[PDB]
Structure formats: C-alpha cells, structure tokens
Amino acid sequence: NTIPIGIALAQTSNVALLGQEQVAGAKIAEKYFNDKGGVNGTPIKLIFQDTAGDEAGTINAFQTLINKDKVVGIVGPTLSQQAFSANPIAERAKVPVVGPSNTAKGIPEIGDYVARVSAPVSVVAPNSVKAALKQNPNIKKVAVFFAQNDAFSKSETEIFQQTVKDQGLELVTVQKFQTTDTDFQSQATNAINLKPDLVIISGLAADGGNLVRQLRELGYQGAIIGGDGLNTSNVFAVCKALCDGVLIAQAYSPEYTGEINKAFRQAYVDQYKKEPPQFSAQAFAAVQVYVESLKALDTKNKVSKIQLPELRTELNKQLLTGKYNTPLGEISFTPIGEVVQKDFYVAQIKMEKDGSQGKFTFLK
Template identity: 35%
Template sequence: MKVLVRKTIGIMTVLMLFILAACSGTSTETGTESESGDNTEQASGTLSAKIGVVSYLTGAGAAYGEAITQGLKLAQEEINEQGEVNIELVIEDSAGEADQALSAAQKLMNDDEILAIIGPTLSTEFLAVAPEADLNGIPIIGTSTTVDGIPEIGDYVFRNAIPESLAIPAAMEKAVERTNAKKVALIYGNDDAVTKGGFEVMERTAKEMGLEIVATETFQKGQSDYNAQLTKIKNGNPDLVLASALYNEGAVIMDQARKMGIDVPFVGGNGFNSPQAIEIAGEAANGLIVGTPWFGESDDPKVVEFNEKYEAKFGKLPDQFAAQAYDALYIYADALKRAGEADRDVFRDALAETKDLEGLLGNFSFDEIGDVVMDVTVLEIKDGKFVEFE
C-alpha cells in the first residue's frame, strides 16, 4: 500500500509539473552543480536518470568529499560512454555538517526527477539524512558510512562501505598476531558518529580478544594539542594504540605520539585510511594499520586501469573513498539497467537484488538488510606508503 500511494502521488506530481512547464515554457537555475557528462543527447532506448549527491566539499575534511565526487565523475563518464544508461549527477555540498547535509538532501528530495541519492560523506551526516530519504521512498547509498546500524534505518537505505565492525577487528587481529600484544590504549573523537562508533568496535574487540586496556582517552574535532591524552597513554606502556579518528586529527596524534617516544603501532578506523594521513604526519604515519576493501598498490588490472584514468583526469592517485564512490555509481547503473525504468520503487527493488557484481573493489553483493558483503584487506603504512600487511 505504501509503495502504491508513493507511485500514485508521483504520477500526479509529474503530470502537474508537465502541465505547468508546458504553460510557462521557461526553466530556472537553482545554483546546484549539475554534472551531465559528455552524452547530453540521449540515444534511442537509453535509460536516463538524475542522481543526487551530497558530499563534504568544503571544510576541514573536504579531501573526503573531493575524492568521492571525483570517483563519481569518472564512473559517470565511463557509464555514459557505454550508452546503456545516461546518468546526470546533481551535486550538493554538506560542508561536513549534519544540518547542512539534511538541507542539501531535502533540496534533492524535492526534485521529483531525482531517482536516488549518494551520500552524505560522514556517518553523522548520513544518520541525519537517511531516515528522511527512507520516509520519502528515495533510495540512498552511503559510500563512506561505516558505523553500525546504517542499513537498518530502512528499506531504502544501503551502503557499499565496509563497516567498522568488519574492518577494525580484521586489522586488530593481524596487529596482535604480529606483535603478540597484551596491552592496548584507546583514543577516539567523542563528537562524531564514525569515531565514536569505531571506538565502540575497538573496545568490544579488545575485550573479546582478552587484551588489557591501559588507557581510554578522548578528543574533539579540530583539536591540535594532544599532550595530556598521549602522556596518559605513554604511562600505560601499551603494545598497540587503537585510534578511532578522521585523518586530520589522527595524523596529528601520530606525529605528536612519535615525538613523545610512543613508537608502537597504531590501529586505525576507516576515517584514518587516507593518503592525507601520510601527507600530514610524514614519517610519523609509519606503523599505522587499517582494514579496508581498497588497496591502491594492487596489480589487479582493474585497479591499475582505474589508477591510470583517475590520475590522468585529476592529477593524483585515488584513495579508498574515490574507489568506493566509483563502484557505487556502477552499482546504481547496474540496478537501473535491471529495473528497466527510472522509478524509485522499482529501482530500489532492483538495487536490493544486487549480487556478485564484479566491481573495482571485488565481488559485491547486498545482504538482506542492504549492507555490503565484501572481503576486507589489511594494510599498513611502511616507508611512507600503504602496503599490504604481511
């Protein structure tokens, strides 16, 4: 009944808009960045869809959003060239703030031509936006949202990002196996959903592994001095430091830790997995261990080709967030082809049935609640670059 009502309202709305447009003969610009790709003229039989994007494009963590939108644009260009579907991206900036992300998403939701939404970037933002998208029957996918409970929000909510509950334990198990660690210290950002969620996974996994937690310290977004927290961690003499942080703060924490003589390995959450951590921390980033579906140094032909295309287009190598966004648009394109029409409910059902899709990051499926099914790779930073953990 819920789907039938949505479809009836949608048809009536489209008819009213068609009548109004025919009468006025004009259109207005909203100021939204719209990326239609190279194929603006549709070939006969080509499915066309507008996809809304909410991305972290300005502010301290804009490198995340930049990578995501660049990954999307590269995928869009390739998909449109293939000719089966034509995708237009309508991009809005969230600035990493939940309220701005919600306003941006509402703007997209009010456009009846928007088939589905990608983003927002941070879990804090996504948790504000996804319930409303689900309520409005608009499919939404998170490409970088890793906290527990994301797909459980509703039937229209999906993600292709490896959750912290998979990535962090995989990294911790590898780190403990190599170092024979017995004691760990934890440090996390207590004002962000992804860093709080990562901490919860770290703490739970440490207890399950029988590790002694010698210190638990917190910090806030934008903090620059971690002397007090790191002094307590150093006094605990841990074998590993478990740090749930975004790359901005995480890199500074590692730099200050090394200067204080804390030379044990760090295990990070998903937000720590960025080349920006190396750029900011330099040699201090060596020894960081993370779990991820993306290994940019892989000799897999798909990864090599993606790296080459991305670097040629944007002047730098891609990171995990670019790769996940790239795959997400291909997941959407595949679902659109199987749906056979740009209808939100039909598209949602096709999306839910995605199984064993060969993507850039590997074989991809959704489980029964819309969460990702994919293998985890553990990486470490060694000699200033991410390498596969051995």
C-alpha cells in the same frame, strides 16, 4: 535527455579530507559508465550538492537534490554522523540512498531506502588488530583513543575495544577527544605514562593525523592502528615522517584482479599518479550500483515513461536485488540493504625519510 543521480558528499570543511576522494571516484564512474552508453543509451548526469561537514548541511543537500534536482537516487553522505540525521529524510521521501563509505553499526536499519556498499566496522576493524599482533606478537598493553562527538568513531572504538579484549590484551586506557581538537597533549601523555605497546585511534583525518604526530613527538615508540577516518593520504601532510608505520584496515585493494577494478585502477592511476584509495573505489561502486540497477529496471520497464515517485521506488527495489562486480569485488545486498561481500586487507603507511611523500603498502 539524461538521468539525474544525486551526489551528496563533503566537498568542503575538514570532512572533505575524506569526501574529496569519494568525489574523485564518483567522477571516474560517471565517465566510465557514460562511455559505455549510460543507461541503455541514456547518459546519466551526476548532480553534486555539497553537504559540508555537519548534519544541517547534509539535510539541505538531500532536500535540494530531491526537490530541486529531481534525482532518482542519492549517493552519500560522507560520514555516518551525517547519515543518521539525514538519511531519514530520504527514507520518508521514498528516495533511495546508497552510502559509499559509512560504516557505523545501524545505517541500513534506518529504513527500506537506505543501502550501503561498505561493510561495517564489526568486520573491518578487527583485521588491523590482528595485523599489529602479527608484526609484534609481544604486544600486551593497549591504549585506545576515540572521537566522542562522531557516530562512526564511537561505533568503531567499541569494536576495537572488544577485539583487544578477545585477543587477551590489557586495555590500559580509553581516552576521548573531539574531531575538532588539534591538541591532544594531556590524553597522549596520560596514555604514554601507562606504557602501551599498541595505540588505536578512531577519529577522522585532521584530528587523527594530529594525534599520531603528537604521540610520536611525546616519545611513544610502539605500534599504532588508525581507524577508517585516518584512511587517506591527506593524513600524510599532518603527521609527515611521524605517520610512518600506522596500520589501517582496508575494504578495497588496487591489486584485486576483477576486470572492472583493472579498468577503474588504470583510469585512476593514469590521472592521479598513485593507486586508487578505498574511498574512491567505494564511491565508484555506489555509482555502479545505480547505473546497473537503472539498466536492469529500464529493460523491464522503460524508465523514460515512469513518473518520478514510482521510478524512485522501483529503482530502490531493483538495486536491492542486484549482484555487482565492482572494484570492491563481487557485492550484493541483504534484504535491509547491508552489503554482502568478502575480503579485507590491511595496509601500512610508509613515509619517505624526509616526510614529504608516502604511500600505503598492503600487507601480504
């Protein structure tokens, strides 16, 4: 006998360039928590249903997990874009959802069954602008790019634009693209002609990486900030040596000294031979929230005896009240499921000259 927890993440499509890191973190969590006896001796079982890259696939995944797999709760989906369309399905069904990495404004407000462990763009994004200004105090002109078809990219760009204004900088252009675009020559040239000192990009991984590369090819020599959708070593293959120097805010640090982070980090490094990425840590934290909430609930009200609809509702109620020492730090939730947490960082992509390898270097 095991307790089923659904994992609805992008395991296929270009969205999997983000989702696969989340999957990795979830699998590390499953082993970590089951090796500690699961839920008071009862193992958890993570049930993976691929969402693919769109809304319909996410709705399908959620419905399968809820109806066929009888899960007590869902971790997912990967994108804010998917969450806005699919999370209402879980809300209506009274099945908890914990989002690992979805940072658009408005997600916890979807309903009483929607929580997230990832602080939103309003507190994440400004960090990287401040870091850019620290590295070059003479930045004056800023060009902003965003993926107009993606909910998170639109939410993130709003924050970047406001931060640029609040820092007293000149916003010389805002250029739009689609996450499915590979070619950005016109937008990149448009921006380059305005002589920006800083370029900010809010897209996802393949698109963001291609845009970074093309900006450099077209002769742009200024600073570049990537938003959260570029926050993966999967961009390295796309921009190669030309990824070097990109600044990306972080909501997780491998060097955070919490005991569970040490365990998580060591498990990750030993397997993948590099530091755990943010998305992996976030997915681990989401699974942790479910395991620790299930343990707390089970101690007060034995879960093996609770029928599924009531188990889902009681689990949701419990998780919202919990305090968790996770790889992300100590976190908890507001009454509507927003994360309460502290500490952000900024990292900078450092590529080897040949462009075949790189790393994220955390700024001190």
